[PDB]
Design a binder for these strands. Structure first.
Length: 345
RNA sequence: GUUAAGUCUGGUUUCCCUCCAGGGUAUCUAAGCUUUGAAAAAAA
């Protein structure tokens, strides 16, 4: 609320907030902050009544409505703004998907159903998930791409930075019946946005965020990659660079796998190292374990691929569903690469 | 007093190894291949 105003109003309201446990209660703090109001009505006078008698009360009980029964009271303008953002994101999403070799089967902005080639999914998702919030380095069709904003050549338009957005990818043979492919493309995402929970950073303590999962699936595998690892998604301009970072690691590893630096056996060897890295509840110990697992099957004995440490303790909870999802992030990265390399033979 | 005659014996005992060191270090698998080819919808 307060970070949404500009001017002296930022100090006007930032006192009427949390005004029940202030040692001041509702409608009692009414003329307890009155100063900033009355000390301003005698600043530029043109309206007949400088006497308030109602203006502090309605505003304070307005905020009391929005917070006691805590929501943001929806107005038509709210709806129109988010819908316009949905459409702008829709068209930039089209721009992204045909920036790849994709074929848009449907794109509602808020949603999407495309058909890309297997080798262009990751950069797509990473772009898409960031683009959905507004992030990346290219003038996409003819509009700019800021941090939380889209600029149509001079005009900054809002976007959906806070709005989490899940994904699903099914590596399908061309001869598979499209019925099953579409149906489990839908079901995977629908039931995985519910079942999947993952250790999320929040104020230092660790909760279990639910959505924002990019699910992958081969003929028998499955994989989950969180996309935000933080709640809320963004509150600072820097936080944007954290969006869809795990898949970015998957990119910077897939590059070095086939560039002739790290073997593919990195993905066979891992099952040897997985139990210790899972059971390791300490940063530097896991650092050394993963570093050894990289070194032991490196093609050049100088590769320095630093997996970040936040990827080390994040677990994945999967309750009451018969799928087999690994409950640790590095296993999911390995399985993601396994799935993608499976659809290349 | 005189003479005359020499005879016996010809290496014994003890100690015969004691103590420490009884393996140390490096390498502990590496690189490949991780499925392929036939069968996907059959007659009553």
């Amino acid at each position: 609320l307060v970070n949404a105003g500009s001017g002296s109003i930022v100090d006007y309201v930032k006192t009427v907030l949390k005004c029940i446990r202030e040692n001041l209660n509702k409608c009692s703090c009414a003329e307890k902050i009155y100063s900033n109001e009355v000390a301003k009505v005698m600043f530029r006078v043109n309206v007949e009544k400088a006497n308030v008698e109602e203006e502090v009360k309605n505003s304070l009980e307005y905020f009391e409505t929005i917070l006691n029964e805590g929501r943001i009271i929806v107005t038509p303008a709210w709806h129109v703004s988010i819908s316009s953002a949905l459409n702008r994101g829709l068209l930039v999403e089209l721009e992204l998907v045909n920036k790849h070799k994709g074929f848009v089967i449907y794109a509602g902005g808020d949603d999407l159903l495309a058909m890309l080639p297997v080798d262009e999914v990751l950069d797509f998702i990473k772009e898409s998930r960031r683009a959905f919030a507004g992030f990346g380095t290219e003038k996409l069709g003819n509009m700019c791409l800021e941090n939380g904003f889209v600029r149509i050549n001079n005009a900054y338009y809002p976007s959906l930075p806070i709005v989490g957005r899940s994904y699903s990818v099914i590596i399908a043979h061309y001869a598979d019946p499209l019925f099953f492919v579409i149906n489990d493309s839908y079901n995977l995402l629908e039931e995985g946005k519910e079942i999947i929970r993952y250790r999320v950073m929040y104020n230092g303590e660790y909760k279990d965020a639910k959505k924002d999962v990019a699910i992958f699936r081969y003929q028998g595998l499955t994989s989950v990659i969180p996309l935000s690892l933080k709640r809320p998604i963004v509150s600072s301009v820097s936080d944007f660079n954290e969006i869809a970072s795990i898949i970015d690691v998957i990119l910077e590893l897939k590059k070095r796998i086939d560039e002739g630096r790290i073997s593919v056996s990195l993905l066979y060897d891992y099952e040897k190292y997985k139990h210790l890295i899972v059971a390791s509840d300490e940063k530097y110990l896991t650092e050394f374990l993963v570093k050894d697992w990289i070194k032991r099957n490196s093609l050049r004995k100088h590769v320095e691929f630093t997996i970040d440490e936040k990827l080390y303790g994040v677990r994945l909870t999967i309750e009451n569903y018969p799928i087999k999802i690994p409950n640790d992030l590095i296993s999911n990265i390995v399985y993601t690469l396994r799935i993608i390399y499976g659809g290349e033979k």
